[PDB]
Symmetry: C3
Subunit: 328 residues, 3 copies
């Protein structure tokens, strides 16, 4: 089979690809390096993170149904922990976790057949208590397996996007001092016992898009134009989310993320089950600022789950008009 | 276009309307006044509330797909805060939030086209940390945009209800003294910092229907007769819910609340995503008392999420019969 | 009508039955005895439990749509509490709760018509605060009402399982001393006030399958062979869950659990609403160990929500292959 070597790009962007496969099955080659580093979640909040390829989430991989995925995974000698990878897209050996455990200084190559279309989570799962801990330290991303003929709607009609954005939502459990301030550690292992105690409450300290509070706002705001069909692929590897585009809708939504199921239409808010990825297409109709949020608004605003989309184009007064301006 | 002026009625009731539109598109005119007042959630629990039209939830608006909605929103001079409105039914300007910010003593008129059929949340969203806070202080309601030809089932067959009840479920975060008792404040702003600390735990002190524990029980119990097709429209603007009618089912359920999607049948329990409204139709078959509950039973019983429905009519022993009475 | 007397078997197993009804409607006779006993959830964690038939969950009942269910429920004189039963499968009298309240030393016989196909929760619901408390002490199980002609897929094609496993997931709220250790009590009533305080936080101390941490792992691991179509019926009577088979998928999933609705395909993770049962069919394609988990991995690993499935058969390198073994 042809081999295609991909250069991954950091989230929320996606590597070059075609929606309709330009060929028959290929072997898709990807490589990622695991990076353990402290990351700043918020102004005075830091996470002893563990990442695929230096980003939270890990980068988006895009292939077609019936392709193979050949991943080279590298755990550099400077890392402290063993790591591996479980693709929810894959069949067998705990998603590949059983075949990919690598120590610092080792690398491994896994091949699987992408037999099922949809957006899927991938995450680290080295075993026992390590599983939740590695995930909530940042080790999860998404692979999207498109149908060979591209996406289809609830009636089997071909559907096309202009842009995909990968929104990786992640919950984190940063320990606190009695006064509410966040603790700092020298490395992941040092912070482990304190982190577990927070994990046990099931209350995240932060819930973020793209690895940090405000990462996709201000200078990181997403961009589009009136008329653009934008696919928002949304992963949550550990906890539920309820995405909502403020000012918009989900035109076609696969909330369970699997493309051969019929999408729902006209949604205000949809539901990403923890341990899954979903996808929503929207055609922008009005210019201006939109917020893409987890619609538990405490999670959106206090915890960090808010992105902005800045949209250019002409305003349509038939859809909405301020008839009487604030007056009094 | 014809203009139709509506008189809103408090929840769980609905203003006069027709399921099948008796005309082509109209401009629907509504008016609401924002009322800031302390409300009693429970025996020794009070909320510094902020409300649309004096009720929690805000009143239900009912229009047809392709109509316009023209809302006059009034923030009386006695209020302390700026307020606005985001309709999830609307397209643009953050659902209208960007065009409706009004200070105490001001009013505003917004028009939008109700382009999509379904039950939708509306809520206050004045910006930043104000967003979750105004919502969890009571500022959310629902607008139902019916298809012009009325509801249709999973097979496109016309479906009709005898009664709609609007169940507005709301989570609240009342601060507590060390001994578990609830704190009281002079106004919303005074209670703000203490409320935020509760919000951060993501654990509501109360989760209520119609603004208070027991509001829809005893004297407030809902009523129906055997044979009645009752539509239960259920909103939750901030947190997930799992409605269940104890003793009944959802005959047709749109849990994501958007009427052009096929409903599911025969449900025991359905799922309202935080930041959305859903709808369930049930035809009553047995007389007696029913409980409509959020089926996290701690949320139902300890937090306040229980309504009763009292149903009159004849008992059917073929469906259920006590064969041997408690004996021993 | 013919009467059929069933011998229940403990979970995760199911009593003898046929998927396609070998006859017209029958009256299905079941009997269960309520057992109040302390149970060990985990190494140093015990629950003052209240059970149907001595198991958590209560045993699975299997009947066909249009059958009757006649249940004899027995509350032995050694018990301390009144108990009853609410079948979500049933119509009227709070699912039967209104007709089945029995004191220690009493028994009752309830008949209902199983008019709706699907997996349904049954649980104890003796009234008021007793409701959540009896459920979170273990009093819930599942009844599966199969269509008379067996299961059908999203296209109406007949579908057949080789094995059903009933996974009863239950959240528990065991009180703790200041040092994090769990408290012990002489009986359920003694532990009540302390348990309520934990219930109020909505944070379970344990979330288990089959009544205990590790119950379905090691010696209790589930078993299958490559090629087996296994139906996983999953109940959660009080709290949401997000089941995921690590290394596999849901081939056909009814997450709301009602068999006349079309199932979704190829799911990675699905969603069981608190107060419901859902069902997922998977055909095993690879041998080895699988984990069936609630995919909030903290709930899976720290709280107890993990089962293992051990699968025998031949490995398929086309689906997955370790191309380069860990090396360095
Ligand atoms: Cu790792
Ligand atoms: Cu996983
Ligand atoms: Cu407001
Ligand atoms: Cu909103
Ligand atoms: Cu009981
Ligand atoms: Cu129930
Ligand atoms: Mg690279
Ligand atoms: Mg400090
Ligand atoms: Mg230090
Ligand atoms: Mg008025
Ligand atoms: Mg006090
Ligand atoms: Mg004072
Ligand atoms: Mg027996
Ligand atoms: Mg102790
Ligand atoms: Mg003692």
């Amino acid at each position: 089979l042809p081999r295609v070597k991909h250069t991954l790009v950091p989230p929320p962007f996606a590597h070059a690809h075609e929606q309709v496969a330009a060929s028959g099955p290929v072997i898709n080659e990807f490589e990622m390096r695991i990076i353990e580093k402290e990351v700043q979640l918020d102004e005075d909040a830091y996470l002893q993170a563990m990442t695929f390829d230096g980003s939270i989430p890990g980068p988006l991989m895009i292939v077609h149904e019936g392709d193979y995925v050949e991943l080279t995974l590298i755990n550099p000698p400077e890392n402290t922990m063993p790591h591996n990878i479980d693709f929810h897209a894959a069949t067998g050996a705990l998603g590949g976790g059983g075949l990919t455990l690598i120590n610092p200084g080792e690398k491994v190559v896994l091949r699987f057949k992408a037999t099922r279309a949809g957006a899927f989570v991938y995450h680290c799962a080295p075993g026992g208590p390590m599983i939740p801990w590695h995930v909530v330290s940042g080790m999860a991303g998404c692979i999207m397996v498109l149908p060979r003929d591209g996406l289809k709607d609830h009636e089997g009609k071909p559907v096309r996007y202009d842009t995909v954005y990968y929104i990786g939502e992640s919950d984190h459990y940063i320990p606190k001092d009695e006064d509410g301030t966040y603790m700092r550690f020298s490395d992941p292992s040092e912070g482990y016992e304190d982190m577990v105690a927070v994990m046990d409450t099931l209350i995240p300290s932060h819930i973020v898009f793209n690895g940090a509070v405000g990462a996709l706002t201000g200078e990181g705001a997403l961009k589009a134009k009136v008329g653009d069909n934008v696919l928002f692929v949304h992963s949550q590897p550990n906890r539920d989310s309820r995405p909502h585009l403020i000012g918009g809708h989900g035109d076609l939504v696969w909330e369970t993320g699997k493309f051969h199921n019929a999408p729902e239409r006209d949604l205000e808010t949809w539901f990403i089950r923890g341990g899954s990825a979903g996808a929503a297409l929207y055609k922008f109709l009005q210019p201006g600022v939109y917020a893409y949020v987890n619609h538990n608004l405490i999670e959106a605003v206090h915890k960090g789950a808010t992105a902005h989309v800045l949209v250019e184009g002409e305003w349509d007064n038939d859809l909405m008009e301020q008839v009487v301006a604030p007056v009094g």
